[PDB]
Amino acid sequence: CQPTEFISRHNIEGIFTFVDHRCVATVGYQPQELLGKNIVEFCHPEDQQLLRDSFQQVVKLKGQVLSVMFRFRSKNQEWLWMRTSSFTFQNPYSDEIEYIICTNTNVK
């Protein structure tokens, strides 16, 4: 059984580099759909800033998992409540964040 939770590997811009397989069970969106696209493009317009603010926040946090709750757009074009536990991945080289590992868990 595929749970309503998936890992969203994307850079600071929101461009996904690697999408989970459980995304289709969560929002119904195919991994290939998120690839090259911004997560903000599939987020509730009035909650887009909420995502961005929290995104920049998790970058400043660095390593601190910040779960932001917002409404994401499904393949049905609907808006579901998802809690994205964003985890900034720091590289051991110079402590640079290569990408943000967002744990997208559907709540509603």
Add this chain to the structure above:
Amino acid sequence: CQPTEFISRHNIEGIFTFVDHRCVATVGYQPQELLGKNIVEFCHPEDQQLLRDSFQQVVKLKGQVLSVMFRFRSKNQEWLWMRTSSFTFQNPYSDEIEYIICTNTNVK
């Protein structure tokens, strides 16, 4: 304010590498308590091999999720039914398993 479900990112041996801040409401065990510990240690004896085989199963799957229902020990040392959805993350480099994403969903 989090549900009885959390993403348990750990290695094949069960050693928790990264645990979301949801385990507190699920089992009471703090993330730091799980870090460096085997999930099988806090697992019900009669369900240890169950989880063990499931771990090997998810490795054979690769990129697939395997939901196993066993009894996990809480901070109260009580046995609760947990539906651990193990997902094997495949690194897009040489297809190496970086870690196992075990979405622990408490049922009973």
